[PDB]
Design a protein around this ligand. Sequence first.
Ligand SMILES: Nc1ncnc2c1ncn2[C@@H]1O[C@H](COP(=O)(O)O)[C@@H](O)[C@H]1O
Ligand SMILES: Nc1ncnc2c1ncn2[C@@H]1O[C@H](COP(=O)(O)O)[C@@H](O)[C@H]1O
Ligand SMILES: Nc1ncnc2c1ncn2[C@@H]1O[C@H](COP(=O)(O)O)[C@@H](O)[C@H]1O
Lengths: 329, 338, 338, 346
Amino acid sequence: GRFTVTLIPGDGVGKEITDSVRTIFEAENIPIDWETINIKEGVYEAVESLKRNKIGLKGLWHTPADQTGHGSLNVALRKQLDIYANVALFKSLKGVKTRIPDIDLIVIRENTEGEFSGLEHESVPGVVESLKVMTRPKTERIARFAFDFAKKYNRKSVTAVHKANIMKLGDGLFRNIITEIGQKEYPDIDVSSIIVDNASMQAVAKPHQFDVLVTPSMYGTILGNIGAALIGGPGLVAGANFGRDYAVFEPGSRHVGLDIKGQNVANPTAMILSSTLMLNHLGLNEYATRISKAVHETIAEGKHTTRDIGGSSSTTDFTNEIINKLSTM
Amino acid sequence: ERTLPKKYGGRFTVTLIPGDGVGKEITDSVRTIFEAENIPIDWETINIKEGVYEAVESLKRNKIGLKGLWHTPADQTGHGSLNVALRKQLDIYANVALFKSLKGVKTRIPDIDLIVIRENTEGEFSGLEHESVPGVVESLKVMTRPKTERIARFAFDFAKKYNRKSVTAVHKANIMKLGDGLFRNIITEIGQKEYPDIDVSSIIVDNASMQAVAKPHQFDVLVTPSMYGTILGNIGAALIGGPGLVAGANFGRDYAVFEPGSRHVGLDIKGQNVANPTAMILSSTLMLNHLGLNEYATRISKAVHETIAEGKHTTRDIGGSSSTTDFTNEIINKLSTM
Amino acid sequence: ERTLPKKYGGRFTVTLIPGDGVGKEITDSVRTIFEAENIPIDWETINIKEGVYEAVESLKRNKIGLKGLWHTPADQTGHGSLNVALRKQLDIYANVALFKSLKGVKTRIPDIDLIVIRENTEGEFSGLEHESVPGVVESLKVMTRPKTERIARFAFDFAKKYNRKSVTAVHKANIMKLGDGLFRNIITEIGQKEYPDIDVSSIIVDNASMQAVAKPHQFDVLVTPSMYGTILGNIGAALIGGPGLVAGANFGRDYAVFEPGSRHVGLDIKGQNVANPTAMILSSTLMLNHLGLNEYATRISKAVHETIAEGKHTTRDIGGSSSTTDFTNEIINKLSTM
Amino acid sequence: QPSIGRYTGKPNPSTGKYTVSFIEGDGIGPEISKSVKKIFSAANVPIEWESCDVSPIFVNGLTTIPDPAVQSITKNLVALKGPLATPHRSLNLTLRKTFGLFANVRPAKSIEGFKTTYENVDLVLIRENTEGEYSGIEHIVCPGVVQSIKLITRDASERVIRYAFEYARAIGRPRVIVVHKSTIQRLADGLFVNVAKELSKEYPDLTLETELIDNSVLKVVTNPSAYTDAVSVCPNLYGDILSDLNSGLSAGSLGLTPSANIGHKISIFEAVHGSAPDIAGQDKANPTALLLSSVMMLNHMGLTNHADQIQNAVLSTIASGPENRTGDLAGTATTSSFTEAVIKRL
Ligand SMILES: Nc1ncnc2c1ncn2[C@@H]1O[C@H](COP(=O)(O)O)[C@@H](O)[C@H]1O
Ligand SMILES: Nc1ncnc2c1ncn2[C@@H]1O[C@H](COP(=O)(O)O)[C@@H](O)[C@H]1O
Ligand SMILES: Nc1ncnc2c1ncn2[C@@H]1O[C@H](COP(=O)(O)O)[C@@H](O)[C@H]1O
């Protein structure tokens, strides 16, 4: 009866935001045991762990921008487990002031390919080429995942974001394969395309027109952050990563919060909500349905909410309001 | 690998087709036992006159399915099986029915274990017929070497995989010398030059029917064309207790659909919660073994096997007084203590 | 069987592509020897800037072809091989060149018998290149496991079929560790777990080039990517006398095109009737053996073999003074008395 | 004005005026165009219009641009094009390649008297329009495998990043932000960033910051004003997206957005909206877009006083009062009435 899930706190507010979940978990006496790991190339041990347990819950690691820096190792984790599908959930929350309200859109991105393929070289000094790979197999895969996902969660529309008018082969292939296999399979769903730049403009100005968006690695980071802002911030976004065999759940917004590490100011809504996603996954979800209502009501209920939403409470206090509301359900 | 069964981070997505009659109840029994065992599968479930399309289309995505039986009209303007439509359109050409008697069940001849493999897409199920002049009707029965070599090998492969020693071809080749002749030859022919370790033999369908009812222990595996399989099937169904105890599965090259091995709709007792889900559950376990789970399968089969062996609390048709609901819960109960 | 070679009541229909340079003359030599031997094949013969389409389309009908070489520009607005175009578009991925010395020919190192198998569609022949900024050019060389496993097996299969004991992979894996590395591995890798009876080894292309020129008898069969095969090929061509003595053939799954193994156009001596058809004829015999004739092949090869061994009456480049015309007729003559 | 794309003035000695190529373009182009010619006339701009046609030839299958227009535009070192249709080699592309245009300047500022969801948005972005993701280089490496190649060079980067420092200086913004993703594009984006960091030093009045698109998009949408002292420089793709995004924030579409395409000695100033073929002739178009590009042009030429005149007053101010405005901004006015209503406060 006891799952053994992998826990990777990671850098920045990672350590605090994970703890929030632990506390809410043992306070709800959820039958899961954390195997928890900490780390330069022991990204090996994260992989190896997840390969045993199959399921994980993680924050974000930090990534250098300097030349002798190590390289994502957030992507390393995904590539090495072929957790190829990222899902981010941008649904606005009741107790949060946002410029455009009542917004509900999903962004599915491919994790292992595209501009995240990390192939680059310098031919002669001062001239650099970064190669962006796009392959039919990896693309058919994500395409079906997206539609399957849209069908499973009764989403009516799926839109492919691309730049196929300029990168006619790369993004072209992507746009075709998606629309192509949304027509001869999944005919019940509305497939369409949109050019990444124009998509970016509609997203900021008129987001309600979008339902599900499928994108290559890059465009997903971009539309992702638009969506993150649209609903309040990176602290409200649940996320999950799927491969065929494994599943790793992380915040849908993908920010480390390095600056506020150890300050107990951080917001765990993101972590907790994607933590609920994980419960639904491994079948629990009585708990998930539960502890989501807890945080949803907590933040809707004015003060006692955390700094970035407009409150004055600390991570610690916000957590305890959830566990409190939870103790009376 | 866009050809394995739908799976996302450890979770299979299987097709569920409850279908007509006790279908809806008998499927539910499985759902309940499944979530109560927290099995990592998610049902994509479909309901339906020609949306037999949507069943096909679904199975083509997921590759795997679990279904009851649909109902079929006998009137002239009726629609046509669409149980067979499903199979023909997916070329799920091989049907396996498992007739193994169960401990807690009174049967006239006990300790019986035989398998009936039938071809699904051809034979008398080819559905070609016409009326030349009024009152004269011809039904054409097609038999082709390719479709026949296929089932022949499936049968032997199956017998080898599950350590079955004997394979017998049921036919009427003494009368339909070309049709059933071809069938009998191709089977025995390729059980001799491949699969030499297995005992191949023939038997005439009528005489087979007689031995089956009188002395069934002489049979191991039976390979038949569409019709003879329906007939020997029901003999076997009766021999072990009834249609509610028979696990079944259908195989094509790419897809697999699991259904009850006896093939009865139970229209009359729909919604009465009197029905017996042993059939559905047991073939449901067959599906688990298939998509590799089978720790669960080994598990939840022992559950139902012990449940029915253990006298009362068993369902109406086996000789008990419990409802589908109650029988299910005894399984989930026995299961919660394993 | 819409996949065997075009054949109508005993008569094959083969594709004939004379091509540029001595092509037209050297092909004719074969025609003449063919009708003079009354060989049951009919030429569908084609001539051509982008009608390399019509060559492909023809070969797709007939499956088999016999061709010379086309010419290829070196200028910037030139069209591009279209010898490779033919092969890439038919996925005729395997080139075989036969370097076996001939009795009546003065060569610096005698009694030499080695085969060079090269991959046709990939490597440095992938023809992917671009200029990033002015004056900086990148040519991309593709190497893929599938295309490489393919040629690897072809080579071993070939070596087994023609009782060749040794197969050596030529590479530059010490520098291009991924590209040529993959090639060297996949070859040795699948010469060890399949084809264990054959001696697999590697050799670095530059060092291979040196041994080939100095001590060629140490080699049996050589497998190479597109480039190294052109290089070792020409070494072998020289070793035995010249480009006019080398039989060649190209293989895919479905099609087969036979051409000279040395791959020179002879533009300079076009129409002079000085050219040597040994190459063309000998690879023409290879084609006969292929489409099963080969009584003829065994025949007309002995003809040319004896003709050239028998001193004068041989063609210019071997050391004779005869013309293509005269050499041909000696073959047809020797042939008329067999 | 920025040293990098410097206008070489010289008014035509026979007239007091400077020469500028027009390119009315098609669709609403003509009407939107003479709308500008009139407003320019009224303010006494030292400018005579030499309109030319960029309808493409096809020398060597590769689309070329007509000699008439080439000579005209290379001569007068400046041009002002309206929108044109989609006539075998992007028309806009062969336009940059034949005139050496390398930098897209895209401002997005809130408009007075037109309410959109985002407020106090005043944004400036310079985009590399030469290389990056948008070099023609892509390859089919085998059956189901494609490579699109992103090209980043110091030479191309240097001269954009310069124009950005120099433009930031020319409009009195302290900060200049290099948008990048050195995180996973170490070499490519890394080079861009280093080139800015190295140039940083010979522009000590400006402060250089570096930001991941991650944050550049997150932060701008949460709060547009945090970049009202901006000027952001970035490689071709990030630029193409962020600029179309910025416009989405400022106006919700891009019928108000002006662009400037700076080349070494030439420079073209255009509106970024389409040809709006269905509203063409009926006098409903909205010159504001092109009109603001005119201002951009004025400043680039040195005619500060006129630019500030036509912008600070006029249009910007006449777009206040719904009797003015156009159909696209709730207004009721025509292209006709907008132009005279403008010239009044001109
Ligand atoms: N736990 C958190 N709660 C709220 N906001 C966060 C959290 N972590 C990160 N952020 C925001 O995301 C940004 C971090 O992005 P970066 O600069 O890429 O590290 C900061 O500006 C924070 O405002
Ligand atoms: N799922 C089932 N399990 C056991 N027996 C059944 C089931 N469905 C129908 N039957 C029996 O079979 C008879 C009707 O069969 P059918 O041919 O399906 O209508 C009824 O008298 C039932 O007793
Ligand atoms: N039929 C032939 N027999 C022998 N050598 C030939 C023949 N045709 C061409 N050559 C030689 O190959 C060279 C032409 O090849 P290439 O350099 O590709 O034009 C010439 O220098 C000739 O000496």
